[PDB]
Structures are given as C-alpha cells and as structure tokens.
Amino acid sequence: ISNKLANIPDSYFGEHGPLPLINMAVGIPDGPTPQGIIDHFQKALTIPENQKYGAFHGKEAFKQAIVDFYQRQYNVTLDKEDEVCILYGTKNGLVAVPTCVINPGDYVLLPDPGYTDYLAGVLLADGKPVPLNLEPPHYLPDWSKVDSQIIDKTKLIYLTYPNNPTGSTATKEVFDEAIAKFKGTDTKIVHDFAYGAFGFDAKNPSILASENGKDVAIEIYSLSKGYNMSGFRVGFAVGNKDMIQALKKYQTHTNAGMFGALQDAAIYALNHYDDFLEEQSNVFKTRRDRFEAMLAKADLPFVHAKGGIYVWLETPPGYDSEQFEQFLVQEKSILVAPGKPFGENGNRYVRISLALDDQKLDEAAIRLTELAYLYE
Amino acid sequence: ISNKLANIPDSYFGEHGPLPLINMAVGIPDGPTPQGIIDHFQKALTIPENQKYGAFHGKEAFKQAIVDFYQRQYNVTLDKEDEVCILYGTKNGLVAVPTCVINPGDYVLLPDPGYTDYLAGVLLADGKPVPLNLEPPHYLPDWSKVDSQIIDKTKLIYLTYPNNPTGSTATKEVFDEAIAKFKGTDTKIVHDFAYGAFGFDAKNPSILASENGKDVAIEIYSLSKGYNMSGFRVGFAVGNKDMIQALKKYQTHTNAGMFGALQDAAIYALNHYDDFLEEQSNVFKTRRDRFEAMLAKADLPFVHAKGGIYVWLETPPGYDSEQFEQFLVQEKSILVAPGKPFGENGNRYVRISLALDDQKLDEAAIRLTELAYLYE
Ligand SMILES: *Cc1c(COP(=O)(O)O)cnc(C)c1O
Numbered sequence: 001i002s003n004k005l006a007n008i009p010d011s012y013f014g015e016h017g018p019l020p021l022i023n024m025a026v027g028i029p030d031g032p033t034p035q036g037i038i039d040h041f042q043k044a045l046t047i048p049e050n051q052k053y054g055a056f057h058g059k060e061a062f063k064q065a066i067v068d069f070y071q072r073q074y075n076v077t078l079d080k081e082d083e084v085c086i087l088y089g090t091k092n093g094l095v096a097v098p099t100c101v102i103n104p105g106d107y108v109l110l111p112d113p114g115y116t117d118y119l120a121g122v123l124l125a126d127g128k129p130v131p132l133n134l135e136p137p138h139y140l141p142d143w144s145k146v147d148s149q150i151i152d153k154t155k156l157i158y159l160t161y162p163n164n165p166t167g168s169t170a171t172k173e174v175f176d177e178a179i180a181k182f183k184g185t186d187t188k189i190v191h192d193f194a195y196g197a198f199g200f201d202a203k204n205p206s207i208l209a210s211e212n213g214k215d216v217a218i219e220i221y222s223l224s225k226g227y228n229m230s231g232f233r234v235g236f237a238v239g240n241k242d243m244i245q246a247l248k249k250y251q252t253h254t255n256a257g258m259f260g261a262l263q264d265a266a267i268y269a270l271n272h273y274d275d276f277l278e279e280q281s282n283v284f285k286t287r288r289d290r291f292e293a294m295l296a297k298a299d300l301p302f303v304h305a306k307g308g309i310y311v312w313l314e315t316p317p318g319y320d321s322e323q324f325e326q327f328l329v330q331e332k333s334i335l336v337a338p339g340k341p342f343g344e345n346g347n348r349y350v351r352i353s354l355a356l357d358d359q360k361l362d363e364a365a366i367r368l369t370e371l372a373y374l375y376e
Numbered sequence: 377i378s379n380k381l382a383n384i385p386d387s388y389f390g391e392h393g394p395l396p397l398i399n400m401a402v403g404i405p406d407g408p409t410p411q412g413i414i415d416h417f418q419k420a421l422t423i424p425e426n427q428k429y430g431a432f433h434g435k436e437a438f439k440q441a442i443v444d445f446y447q448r449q450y451n452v453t454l455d456k457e458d459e460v461c462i463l464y465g466t467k468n469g470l471v472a473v474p475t476c477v478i479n480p481g482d483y484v485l486l487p488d489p490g491y492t493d494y495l496a497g498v499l500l501a502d503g504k505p506v507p508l509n510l511e512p513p514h515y516l517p518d519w520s521k522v523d524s525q526i527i528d529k530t531k532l533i534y535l536t537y538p539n540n541p542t543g544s545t546a547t548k549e550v551f552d553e554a555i556a557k558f559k560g561t562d563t564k565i566v567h568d569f570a571y572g573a574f575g576f577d578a579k580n581p582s583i584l585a586s587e588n589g590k591d592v593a594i595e596i597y598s599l600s601k602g603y604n605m606s607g608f609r610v611g612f613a614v615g616n617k618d619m620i621q622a623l624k625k626y627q628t629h630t631n632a633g634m635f636g637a638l639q640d641a642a643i644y645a646l647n648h649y650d651d652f653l654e655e656q657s658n659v660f661k662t663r664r665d666r667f668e669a670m671l672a673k674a675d676l677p678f679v680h681a682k683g684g685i686y687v688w689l690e691t692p693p694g695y696d697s698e699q700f701e702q703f704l705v706q707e708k709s710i711l712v713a714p715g716k717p718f719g720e721n722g723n724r725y726v727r728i729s730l731a732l733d734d735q736k737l738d739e740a741a742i743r744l745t746e747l748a749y750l751y752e
C-alpha cells in the first residue's frame with residue numbers, strides 16, 4: 001500500500017440486541033425513485049448514443065437542465081461551459097476538489113462537527129486538514145475565532161448547510177459574511193449542498209445567490225436524497241469558473257464521461273420534480289416534529305434540526321458517542337451514527353436518521369424515551 | 377489550478393474535407409448492447425435495493441460472476457473478497473493504481489507505443505513515468521534493454537496485450553518472462569486487458585494464468601468493447617491481493633458503491649455472453665482481413681494486427697503522424713488517431729479503427745490505397 005493511502009482512516013461506515021433492529025444510522029430517504037424517472041431511464045437504455053462513449057463533460061441537455069434548475073430554484077445565472085461540472089455522485093467530486101485546487105502543505109478548513117468524507121480528499125492531495133470549530137445550538141462559523149495564522153494559510157474551506165450531522169442551516173447573511181471574509185484572498189469555498197431540498201422552516205439558500213458567491217465558491221448538489229436516487233451516482237458542481245475548470249480537467253483524466261441513459265434520467269428528474277423536492281422536505285419536517293416532540297416531552301437533550309434528515313442527540317453522562325452507540329445496539333437494538341467520526345465536537349452526540357418507516361420511527365422514539373433516567 | 381493537475385497533458389481525445397467523413401479515430405465497436413443485457417437493466421431499475429446506496433465493494437453475485445468468468449475463461453482461481461475489485465469503467469481504476477500502490481518519485485514503466493491514459497495516473501501520484509520501448513513488428517518487452525538503473529527503481533509497470541495502438545498480442549511465455557523478471561522484487565505489474573475478447577489467430581492469454589501471476593500482477597478487464605457497453609462505465613480488477621486491497625480502500629474514499637442496476641446488467645453480461653465475445657472477435661478478424669488485404673495489395677506499409685480493433689499504419693515519408701492526420705482529414709475526410717500521443721515510437725504511425733460499418737470501411741480502404749504514390 002502507498003504511504004498516502006495508508007494515512008487515510010477507514011471509511012467509518014464502509015449484530016443487534018434482543019429487540020427487532022431499527023437502523024437509524026441511515027443516510028437517505030426510504031422512498032422509491034419516482035416512477036417517471038424510472039420510466040425515462042428504461043427508455044434511455046435503447047438509445048444508440050446512450051450505449052456508447054459520449055462527450056466527457058456531459059450532454060448539452062444535462063448542462064442546460066442544471067443551469068435551468070439553479071435559475072428557477074435560486075435565481076443563480078450559470079454558464080453551461082464555464083460554471084457547470086457533472087459529478088459521478090457528489091462524494092467523488094467533493095473528495096476530488098483538493099487534488100484539483102490546492103498544493104502540498106496547503107491548509108483546508110473542515111467543519112467540526114461535519115461530514116466524514118472530506119478528510120480523505122484533503123489527505124489525497126497532501127493538504128493539511130484543520131478543524132472549523134462549530135458550536136451548538138446553531139453551528140455557524142465564527143471567523144474571528146479561527147487562529148489568524150491558520151486563516152492566512154488556508155486555501156480551501158468546506159461548508160455544509162444543512163450540516164451533516166447537526167442539521168444546522170445557513171442564511172443569505174451567513175454566506176455574505178463568509179464571502180466578504182475570503183474575497184480577494186486565495187481561499188476558496190466548497191459548499192456541500194446535499195441536503196438543499198430539506199429546509200424545514202425556510203428554504204435553504206445557495207452560496208451562489210449571495211452577491212459575489214461565484215468569485216470565491218463552488219456549490220455541489222446531489223440528486224441522491226432529494227430524488228431518492230442515491231444508488232444512481234449522479235450530482236453536479238456549480239460556480240467559480242477556475243474551480244469548475246480544474247474539476248472538469250481532472251475528470252477528463254480519471255473518467256470518460258457519464259452514462260448517457262443516467263444523464264437522461266437526471267435531466268428528467270431536474271426538469272420535472274420541483275414539487276417532489278418540496279414533498280420530501282415536508283415529509284421529513286413532520287417526521288422531525290413527531291420525533292423531537294417525543295424527545296422533548298421525556299427531557300432527552302437534543303439539538304433541534306433545521307434541515308437534512310437527522311436529529312443530533314446528546315449522549316447521557318458517563319457515555320461517549322461510541323459507548324452510547326454500543327449501548328443502543330446491544331440493549332435497545334437501535335443502530336445510530338456516533339458523533340465521533342464527524343469530529344471532536346461530536347464526541348458526546350449521536351446522529352439519528354429519520355429516514356425510515358413513519359412507523360418504525362415511533363417505536364424507536366418510545367425505545368429512546370425509556371432512557372430518560374440516564375440523563376438525570 | 378493545482379500544480380499537480382497543471383502538469384497533466386490534456387486528454388488528446390478529450391472539421392473535414394470535401395468528402396463525406398469517415399471517423400476511423402474511434403475506439404469501440406459500432407454495434408448495440410445485446411438486447412438481453414438491456415432487458416435485464418430495465419428490470420433491475422425497479423428493484424428497491426438497486427435504487428439505494430449498497431455495499432461499497434459490490435454485490436456478492438457480481439463478485440461471483442467475475443470469478444466464474446475468469447475460471448471458465450482463463451482457468452484462473454480468484455477469491456471474491458481478496459482478489460476482486462469492481463471498477464467504474466476501467467479508465468478510472470487504471471489511473472487510480474499508482475495513487476494506491478506507489479510513493480512520490482517511484483518510477484513507472486509505460487508502453488511506448490502504448491495507451492494514452494496511464495501517464496495521468498502516474499503524475500497524479502507524483503511518480504516518474506519512464507517509457508517501455510517496444511519495437512515492431514511484435515512490440516514485446518525486452519527486459520535486457522531496459523537500463524539496469526531504471527529497473528531497480530521501478531515500482532510499477534503497465535502492460536497492454538492486445539496493445540492499443542499497435543494491436544500486438546502476448547503469449548503465456550511472454551508473461552512467464554515478465555513474472556520471472558520481477559517476482560521477489562518490489563515491482564508490480566498492471567495488465568490492461570481491455571481487448572481480451574479480440575484475439576484473431578489465438579485466444580489472448582491472461583497474465584494471471586501464468587504460474588505465479590497473482591504474486592506480481594493484477595489484471596484489469598472491461599465490459600466496454602467486448603459487450604458493446606462502453607457508455608455504461610463498468611469493469612473490474614483481478615489478482616494480487618495487496619494491490620486489489622489498496623484499490624478497494626481507495627474506492628471506499630472516492631466512491632460509495634456501484635449502481636445496483638448497473639451491477640445486475642454486468643452480472644447478466646458476464647454470465648451469459650461468452651459466445652457473443654467470440655462473435656465480436658470473429659467480426660473484427662474478418663474486418664481486419666479485408667482492410668489489410670486492400671492495404672497490402674497497394675503496397676501501403678502497416679503492422680499486421682493480431683488483436684484489438686485497430687490497424688497501425690505507417691505514415692508516408694515527409695509526413696509525421698500529426699501532419700498525416702491533418703492530411704487525411706483535409707484531403708480524404710478520414711479521421712485517424714495520430715501515433716504521437718501513444719508515445720515517441722508512434723511518431724510515424726497512425727491508428728485506424730475498424731469499428732465502423734462493414735461498409736464505410738471498404739470506402740475508407742479505397743480512399744487510402746489511392747495514396748500508395750506517397751509511399752514510394
Ligand atoms: C449524502 C452526502 C454526500 C454524498 O452524496 P452522493 O451524491 O450520494 O455521493 C455528500 N455530502 C453530504 C453532507 C451528504 O450527506
């Protein structure tokens with residue numbers, strides 16, 4: 001094995017107690033792909049151009065469905081050539097960014113608590129990952145608290161709103177502040193918008209809808225959660241021309257274009273399923289309302305979720321995230337995601353996925369409320 | 377842009393004269409995906425597990441279809457966990473290998489003339505690419521002619537039989553020699569078996585069917601050309617456990633598993649289409665026979681193709697590969713692949729794809745034979 005790869009901690013998500021298992025460690029809604037997307041994929045398989053190698057950077061109709069989506073969704077004007085890069089699932093693009101953008105020894109700020117997969121990308125590019133310390137209840141950056149020396153050396157920053165695992169959301173103004181802090185520096189921003197569709201009390205803002213957003217940032221959007229297409233492996237990067245062009249160049253070397261039929265299904269999804277995205281957000285909103293109501297009534301301490309598909313729950317005293325994870329699976333047959341892999345600041349929380357039977361979730365709630373005595 | 381990415385020469389394949397255009401610069405057969413593979417993909421889209429995230433390293437049935445294929449095809453016994461890694465199209469896996477296997481400053485031997493895409497992988501891993509000089513008519517390695525100092529420093533070697541662009545084939549014995557040369561050294565081999573199905577006068581051998589093959593090498597196999605599934609993006613690596621495990625680890629960080637429905641279509645292909653692979657080889661065999669007959673009769677100098685889908689044609693005196701490429705498109709409306717991007721040793725050849733209408737190919741032949749006067 002190479003030294004570079006040896007450095008990389010295993011993908012943390014790469015047995016149960018007596019009770020029937022409830023797996024609340026799941027990303028991703030439980031629902032099927034809308035039938036219309038399925039029907040169009042089925043049809044796209046019979047198309048001669050779809051069976052064969054195509055243009056590396058994607059169909060014109062795909063690039064166009066992307067800019068159209070961003071325009072009517074976020075009033076963001078994008079150029080199809082300069083400001084759009086199709087991704088083979090967003091994980092692939094997110095982990096590619098540092099290789100494309102930074103040089104050995106460059107500092108990269110990573111949200112703590114934040115998403116697990118970024119670290120690998122930084123390490124694959126010989127960068128130096130440094131935590132962006134986010135604090136409850138709202139987990140927003142505090143740029144004045146980042147060491148002045150680190151800010152100066154930072155060439156890339158990941159942001160994630162809605163945040164995985166904390167469910168925290170951003171506003172136009174918090175993006176304004178980030179952009180103003182780093183415009184005219186060599187620091188760029190990657191905003192991971194995987195949960196863009198899931199905004200409970202307010203539609204989540206794009207970083208690119210903030211004035212000057214494209215000057216500092218790209219935004220990465222996934223079809224996985226919004227459209228129940230997680231297994232399909234399709235997303236896109238949008239924004240800063242320089243960053244987009246570097247990604248595009250990287251993908252001409254590591255890939256030979258996206259499956260044409262997958263592109264057509266993606267086009268169909270983006271063009272026709274705005275209402276469904278709304279439906280998805282609403283379904284998780286109430287799922288959240290019911291689950292957090294159960295928790296609050298039994299005085300279990302949690303951080304209220306503002307978007308995404310999870311609740312960020314405190315561990316009780318005398319349990320860390322991994323001890324509480326093992327407790328819940330052993331005693332309660334509830335699988336949760338421990339806060340630890342999400343960063344140091346996740347040490348005393350667990351992540352709970354609401355992406356299961358609107359049924360199951362109720363039994364899981366009653367199971368958890370029984371543990372109220374642990375929090376005294 | 378990052379320094380690392382800036383180093384990488386553009387993907388060379390990332391206007392016409394008066395005559396109707398014949399594009400002989402194409403990889404990939406012209407035929408459709410067999411209907412049976414299509415039907416099973418269509419059906420696989422409706423399967424709940426296929427629409428969602430699955431196991432990173434692939435379905436058991438896929439791992440099993442791979443080992444079964446290798447067993448009945450090449451009498452090679454493989455372990456499903458230890459010796460099989462599914463690839464998102466082989467290009468992705470081929471370019472990943474150096475990142476997984478070598479360290480900065482390690483030498484990697486690349487076939488000259490050989491495939492275009494390897495160089496990027498080496499450079500992405502900060503390795504030092506060095507040409508493996510192959511000579512006509514047979515383009516086989518001569519290990520005694522590699523500088524003793526280079527061999528000692530080499531940690532990885534790419535081999536490609538059938539070779540792209542030269543169409544050269546290997547034998548069990550040439551693999552025996554390679555394995556004996558590097559067994560017990562820290563040099564590993566990656567054999568690119570993209571044209572495994574296309575063996576004209578003899579079935580192409582696996583490097584893993586040679587005694588001790590798995591001790592030094594992995595072999596990478598693609599469904600693109602064999603099964604007319606080039607746009608689908610599916611292949612696999614097979615062999616050396618250490619190398620396979622490094623690739624598998626790399627793919628847990630850069631990916632989240634292969635589309636389940638794509639896996640099912642791939643399973644179906646591997647399990648049921650041995651005869652079709654034979655058919656494909658035979659179709660290109662005769663296409664080659666007819667085209668090379670035309671060339672030989674008019675005394676146009678070429679290297680006889682033994683496998684793959686191309687003919688490797690000499691440029692006439694006073695034209696290099698790029699000048700001859702421009703000549704053919706301008707004057708003859710024939711697009712060819714210039715030898716140059718395939719290496720220094722391709723400077724005075726062009727690559728001609730037989731992957732077009734069994735019709736077209738005849739007109740392209742007569743167009744080319746008219747140029748016999750240039751070779752005097
Ligand atoms: C889901 C997830 C991803 C990965 O999404 P894919 O497009 O399916 O690879 C990236 N970032 C966050 C925050 C996620 O939750």
Ligand SMILES: *Cc1c(COP(=O)(O)O)cnc(C)c1O
Binds near residue numbers: 536540599
């Ligand atoms: C076709 C080609 C590849 C790429 O194959 P994919 O699986 O479609 O990415 C790799 N090596 C050689 C020699 C090729 O001709």
